[PDB]
Amino acid sequence: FAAAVGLAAPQXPAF
């Protein structure tokens, strides 16, 4: 499951 978060992570600041 690491990939799930790692691929998402750079988009988080769109918040």
Side-chain angles (χ1 to χ4, degrees), residues 1-13:
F1 58 79
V5 180
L7 304 184
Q11 311 311 318

